[PDB]
Amino acid sequence: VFRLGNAYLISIDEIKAGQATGRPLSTRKASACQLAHDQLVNRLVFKGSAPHKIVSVFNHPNITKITSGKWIDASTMKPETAEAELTQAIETIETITRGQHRATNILIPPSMRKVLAIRMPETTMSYLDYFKSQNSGIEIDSIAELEDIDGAGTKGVLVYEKNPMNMSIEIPEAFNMLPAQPKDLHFKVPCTSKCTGLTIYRPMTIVLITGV
Amino acid sequence: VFRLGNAYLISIDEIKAGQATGRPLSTRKASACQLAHDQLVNRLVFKGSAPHK
Amino acid sequence: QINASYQRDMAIALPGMVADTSKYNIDGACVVNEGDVLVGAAVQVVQAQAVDGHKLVKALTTGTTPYGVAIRSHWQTVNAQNQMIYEDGGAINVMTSGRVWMLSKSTEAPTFGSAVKLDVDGQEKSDGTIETTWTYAGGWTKYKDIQLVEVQLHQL
Amino acid sequence: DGHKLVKALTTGTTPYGVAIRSHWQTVNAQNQMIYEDGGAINVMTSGRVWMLSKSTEAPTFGSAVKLDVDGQEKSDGTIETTWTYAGGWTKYKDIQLVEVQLHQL
Amino acid sequence: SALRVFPVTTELSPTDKTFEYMTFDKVGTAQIIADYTDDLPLVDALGTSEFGK
Amino acid sequence: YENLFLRPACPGNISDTSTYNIDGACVAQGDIGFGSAVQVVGIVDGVKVVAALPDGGTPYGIAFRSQYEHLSGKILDGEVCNVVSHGRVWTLTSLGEAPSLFSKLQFGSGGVVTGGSGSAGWTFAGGFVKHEDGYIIEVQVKQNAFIAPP
Amino acid sequence: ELHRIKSQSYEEDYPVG
Amino acid sequence: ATMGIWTAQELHRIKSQSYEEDYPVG
Amino acid sequence: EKRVTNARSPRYGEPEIYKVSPGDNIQPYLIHHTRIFIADGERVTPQMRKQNQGWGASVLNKSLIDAICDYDYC
Numbered sequence: 001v002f003r004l005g006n007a008y009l010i011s012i013d014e015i016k017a018g019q020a021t022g023r024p025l026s027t028r029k030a031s032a033c034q035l036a037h038d039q040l041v042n043r044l045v046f047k048g049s050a051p052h053k054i055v056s057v058f059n060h061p062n063i064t065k066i067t068s069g070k071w072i073d074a075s076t077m078k079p080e081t082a083e084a085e086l087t088q089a090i091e092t093i094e095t096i097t098r099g100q101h102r103a104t105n106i107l108i109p110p111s112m113r114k115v116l117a118i119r120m121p122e123t124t125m126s127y128l129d130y131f132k133s134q135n136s137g138i139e140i141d142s143i144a145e146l147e148d149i150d151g152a153g154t155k156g157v158l159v160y161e162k163n164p165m166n167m168s169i170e171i172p173e174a175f176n177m178l179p180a181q182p183k184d185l186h187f188k189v190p191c192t193s194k195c196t197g198l199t200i201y202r203p204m205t206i207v208l209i210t211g212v
Numbered sequence: 213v214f215r216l217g218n219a220y221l222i223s224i225d226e227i228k229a230g231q232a233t234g235r236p237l238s239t240r241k242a243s244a245c246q247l248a249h250d251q252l253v254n255r256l257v258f259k260g261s262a263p264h265k
Numbered sequence: 266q267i268n269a270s271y272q273r274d275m276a277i278a279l280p281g282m283v284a285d286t287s288k289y290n291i292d293g294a295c296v297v298n299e300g301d302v303l304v305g306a307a308v309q310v311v312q313a314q315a316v317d318g319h320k321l322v323k324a325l326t327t328g329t330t331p332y333g334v335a336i337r338s339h340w341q342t343v344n345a346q347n348q349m350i351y352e353d354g355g356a357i358n359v360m361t362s363g364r365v366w367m368l369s370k371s372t373e374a375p376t377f378g379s380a381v382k383l384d385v386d387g388q389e390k391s392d393g394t395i396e397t398t399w400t401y402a403g404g405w406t407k408y409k410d411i412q413l414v415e416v417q418l419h420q421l
Numbered sequence: 422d423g424h425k426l427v428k429a430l431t432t433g434t435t436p437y438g439v440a441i442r443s444h445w446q447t448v449n450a451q452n453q454m455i456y457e458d459g460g461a462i463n464v465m466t467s468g469r470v471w472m473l474s475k476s477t478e479a480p481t482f483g484s485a486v487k488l489d490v491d492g493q494e495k496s497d498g499t500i501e502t503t504w505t506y507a508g509g510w511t512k513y514k515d516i517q518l519v520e521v522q523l524h525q526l
Numbered sequence: 527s528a529l530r531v532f533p534v535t536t537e538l539s540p541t542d543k544t545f546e547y548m549t550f551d552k553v554g555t556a557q558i559i560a561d562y563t564d565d566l567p568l569v570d571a572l573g574t575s576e577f578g579k
Numbered sequence: 580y581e582n583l584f585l586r587p588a589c590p591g592n593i594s595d596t597s598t599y600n601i602d603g604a605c606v607a608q609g610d611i612g613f614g615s616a617v618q619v620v621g622i623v624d625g626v627k628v629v630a631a632l633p634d635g636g637t638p639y640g641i642a643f644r645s646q647y648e649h650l651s652g653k654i655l656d657g658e659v660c661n662v663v664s665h666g667r668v669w670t671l672t673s674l675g676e677a678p679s680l681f682s683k684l685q686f687g688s689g690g691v692v693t694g695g696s697g698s699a700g701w702t703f704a705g706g707f708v709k710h711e712d713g714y715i716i717e718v719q720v721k722q723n724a725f726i727a728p729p
Numbered sequence: 730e731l732h733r734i735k736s737q738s739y740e741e742d743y744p745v746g
Numbered sequence: 747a748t749m750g751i752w753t754a755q756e757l758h759r760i761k762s763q764s765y766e767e768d769y770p771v772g
Numbered sequence: 773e774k775r776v777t778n779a780r781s782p783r784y785g786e787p788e789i790y791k792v793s794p795g796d797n798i799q800p801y802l803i804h805h806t807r808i809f810i811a812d813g814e815r816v817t818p819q820m821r822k823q824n825q826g827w828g829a830s831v832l833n834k835s836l837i838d839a840i841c842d843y844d845y846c
Contacts, residue, residue: 030797033556282570420719421681444751542733546734
């Protein structure tokens with residue numbers, strides 16, 4: 001478990017100064033700290049930190065990675081490759097745990113929702129509708145963290161089973177404020193919190209499709 | 213007449229750990245400070261200090 | 266339809282922002298009427314009062330000793346080019362010790378603990394002609410079209 | 422990210438600070454407090470601190486400090502610093518400690 | 527069809543001749559620390575305005 | 580975000596509320612006058628024994644004015660003493676004209692400022708007023724500036 | 730005194746995650 | 747001996763769940 | 773938030789629902805007028821009443837302010 005923190009400064013002149021409208025500067029500065037803490041938690045979950053020996057979810061050495069042909073190749077949609085690879089990933093999760101775990105959640109890049117909206121030829125209902133009809137009981141969502149997975153434009157898709165006994169995030173201490181410590185003519189307020197990152201108990205229930 | 217003094221430090225994490233595990237640290241540090249004060253008084257009485265005359 | 270959620274990260278620093286709270290030392294002074302001073306640029310003292318010690322400061326000049334770095338404060342104006350500065354006549358806050366974000370025009374990230382070289386204009390430069398005592402703190406980032414660097418200031 | 426990376430002092434390097442005591446952050450091994458890898462540390466950059474010594478005689482107040490290659494004070498060490506001796510010189514049970522004053526790099 | 531296609535507001539007095547609105551911004555960051563820590567990153571804010579007739 | 584000034588301008592007192600440090604666990608050998616440099620001659624039981632600056636010594640701090648510890652007017656032998664080790668302070672001087680700003684000061688015998696051309700040490704802070712047909716200057720003391728010769 | 734200020738201000742939004 | 751006043755076990759947690767390997771019969 | 777000018781109701785021309793934004797890191801919310809009583813100060817000319825969003829003025833007018841002000845100077 002690790003601890004997080006920052007601080008902010010404010011002066012009596014700025015406190016006394018008034019404005020036409022809007023939230024006060026103290027409130028805005030206090031909200032900025034909470035936003036920064038939440039963003040740091042997300043960044044620890046999705047990116048890791050080498051010096052602190054925190055392993056990200058894309059760099060875990062015990063999960064299954066699948067190389068994929070590109071779904072979009074120079075504005076040329078391939079709506080069958082996506083379905084084939086998704087079915088392959090689901091079957092891999094099914095057959096790697098010997099039937100004790102079934103895939104339930106898919107996360108895809110937000111820019112690839114156009115591939116799954118194509119009408120299948122010589123019919124009405126789309127590829128996504130056919131996939132849902134054949135695999136009723138699964139949830140598909142979009143995450144912007146998947147647009148880039150290694151800093152160079154590499155995309156990916158994540159298929160997993162959401163279950164507390166398989167993986168979870170701990171936040172033992174919530175975000176809080178400490179009393180200001182006055183100086184000559186200004187103040188100072190520190191902020192602290194705690195977190196742990198992401199831990200996986202069964203790394204055989206997660207599949208990452210890279211290169212998409 | 214003369215004057216004495218000392219101090220000690222402690223942190224929030226240490227305070228919470230002590231109150232959670234049962235044995236605190238501030239009590240021990242305060243006891244050490246008090247015993248140091250008393251020992252300094254006794255040493256001053258029975259040995260003195262040349263630079264302070 | 267498939268729901269989507271987006272993500273975006275805030276900027277790290279602003280020109281003249283105090284880096285952290287590790288034993289800083291800021292004092293007030295008066296700017297001489299000759300020329301304005303941009304935040305994040307070093308300043309020099311031209312004359313100090315004898316009764317107390319109040320100082321008059323202006324922009325850096327060739328062959329002169331820097332004194333501090335201008336920092337963001339309530340007293341601050343905006344020039345024609347939307348860049349924030351300190352007006353010719355008024356109070357200025359100058360930091361003389363601690364970590365600060367400072368304007369720069371170099372191209373390669375500096376190494377930890379090496380000496381800091383300034384330019385004529387008072388902005389950090391990897392091969393400047395002005396020698397200083399300050400050090401690099403490691404922080405290297407870019408505001409929108411602006412380069413910034415983290416400088417540790419020792420009292421002169 | 423801004424996190425500094427610290428490690429034990431070696432030959433020909435430059436000291437930056439001294440690890441200080443903490444009843445929560447430190448881990449207990451070989452009957453001593455250490456900082457295990459991949460964890461936060463408390464470095465000290467200014468003030469008076471007690472440091473382990475390998476010398477046999479008391480130093481001179483106000484003189485310069487010289488360290489060994491393992492990060493311990495020595496009377497005739499190889500690595501030169503700008504820190505000073507603050508005057509203190511004592512001995513715990515079979516451990517030698519000396520009071521050294523640190524200023525910012 | 528302009529008045530029916532776009533929304534209409536009435537928040538000006540008839541004697542008024544200019545108006546303005548303001549937008550703000552924020553910065554900051556965070557780190558991982560220990561119990562005895564004396565430096566922490568700082569945050570700030572900004573502001574902007576526009577006009578009309 | 581600014582530092583306040585401190586108005587009384589007498590010798591031996593502090594001139595600003597910037598970062599300062601006062602070493603209050605000391606004792607005096609001989610007599611010391613407010614506003615003079617002192618040196619450390621020895622250490623007993625965590626206490627520093629100080630004396631007025633001789634020729635060849637390294638200054639350590641400047642005696643500090645207090646209205647409870649020193650009821651006489653100066654610091655007497657065998658008295659607990661306040662010494663400023665870091666900060667801006669008003670010092671007695673024998674100089675006639677103000678030196679260049681941010682120069683290096685040099686201390687004559689008795690702990691008085693007489694030089695402005697030193698190699699390293701404390702620096703002039705820009706204050707120069709007059710006291711008793713003599714002058715007072717403002718010095719910036721730093722902790723590790725003067726190092727005792729081996 | 731002929732210049733009003735809009736009652737509503739716009740905040741640049743930073744999504745969390 | 748210059749250790750702390752808290753042992754590791756006093757600041758340690760054991761998760762109330764065990765994982766069992768599975769061997770399907772046929 | 774919402775203004776009602778309905779013909780049949782004599783309540784036409786004054787707001788129905790109020791939006792309150794106290795702050796204190798809680799979301800601003802909406803209240804029906806029945807729960808709300810608005811307390812005004814002293815009367816002003818309607819051309820300024822509608823310019824101040826149907827609200828009164830301070831009891832500390834500028835004449836009072838500077839009449840009080842010059843006293844300490846005296």
